[PDB]
């Protein structure tokens, strides 16, 4: 089939690649069970302004992205850097929630690389940003004559002056109040401080498996190693940036890694 013939002359003809399949999947994590306070993030009694947006950091918990994913009470859900369905499985270094109310005519300004009177002076967005923003109008929560909302490097709070209040009237469409919330996800190569609802699992060694140490993916023969990791060291590496030991996040230990044998298949005939 590979020579395009019916008569194969005497020789040695490479044909394929034998790469041992992995046996099974192995998932390790730190045994933590805190719930990230997503309630106050989305059920805050009073949202900040576009110039005084709050930045409250969450950590050391688990985040159920589905129970917020199904939220139809919100007007928009657009995730730039990552596919929001996989958030429930993705887990990363940190999060940052920023809540504030805007007018309906500004939701397009909130995007990585966009501009506008809001997107530049008082709320710049990062260019390499990875994450997403959620939003919803608040015609029945903020507008009553709501004029207590003002506007003037990204995420700088610069707290005839440019001070100016938004004229909010419950009878407005684009002139309606709109509550917005954005999240930032920095996928550094670091010990993740938050992870989604992923249950830890057992560990097996000396067998091609699918190891997932806090998100570090790959397959190999997880043999025990004597690499003296000084207690501040998390991963290992090699000459050319190849992970070559890790630390089991659920219980400290240092074990080697080697990708199990592959190699082309030659056919003699």
């Amino acid at each position: 089939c590979t020579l395009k013939s019916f008569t194969v002359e005497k020789g040695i003809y490479q044909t394929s690649n034998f790469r041992v399949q992995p046996t099974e999947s192995i998932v390790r994590f730190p045994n933590i069970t805190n719930l990230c306070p997503f309630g106050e993030v989305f059920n805050a009694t009073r949202f900040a302004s576009v110039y005084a947006w709050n930045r409250k950091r969450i950590s050391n918990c688990v985040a159920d992205y589905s129970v917020l994913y199904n939220s139809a009470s919100f007007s928009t859900f657009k995730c730039y850097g990552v596919s929001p369905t996989k958030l429930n499985d993705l887990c990363f270094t940190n999060v940052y929630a920023d809540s504030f109310v805007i007018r309906g005519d500004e939701v397009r300004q909130i995007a990585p690389g966009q501009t506008g009177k809001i997107a530049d002076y008082n709320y710049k967005l990062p260019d390499d940003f990875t994450g997403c923003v959620i939003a919803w109008n608040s015609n029945n929560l903020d507008s009553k004559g709501n004029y207590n909302y003002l506007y003037r490097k990204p995420f700088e709070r610069d707290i005839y002056f440019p001070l100016q209040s938004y004229g909010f009237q419950p009878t407005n469409v684009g002139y309606q109040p709109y509550r917005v919330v954005v999240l930032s996800f920095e996928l550094l190569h670091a010990p993740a401080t938050v992870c989604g609802p992923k249950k830890s699992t057992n560990l097996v060694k000396n067998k091609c498996v699918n190891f997932n140490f806090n998100g570090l993916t790959g397959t190999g023969v997880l043999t025990e190693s004597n690499k003296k990791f000084l207690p501040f060291q998390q991963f290992g590496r090699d000459i050319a940036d190849t992970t070559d030991a890790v630390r089991d996040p659920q219980t400290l230990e240092i074990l080697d890694i080697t990708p199990c044998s592959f190699g082309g298949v030659s056919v003699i005939t």
């Binding site: 850097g81 990552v82 596919s83 369905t85 996989k86 993705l90 996928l187 993916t217 940036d241």
Partner: protein, 50 residues
């Protein structure tokens, strides 16, 4: 010695290439494969493959 060193240098730069973005949002293929829905992973992985 020079022959051997030339070949080792070539191999080493070849393998080092794997850790470069070339314009992608990452160089760890599985991340793009575990972060983006296919409608965009197509673009990213395309850049990396090129």
């Amino acid at each position: 010695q020079d022959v051997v060193n030339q070949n080792a240098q070539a191999l080493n730069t070849l393998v080092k290439q794997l850790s470069s973005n070339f314009g992608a949002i990452s160089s760890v293929l599985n991340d793009i494969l575990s972060r983006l829905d296919p409608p965009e992973a197509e673009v990213q992985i395309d850049r990396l493959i090129t």
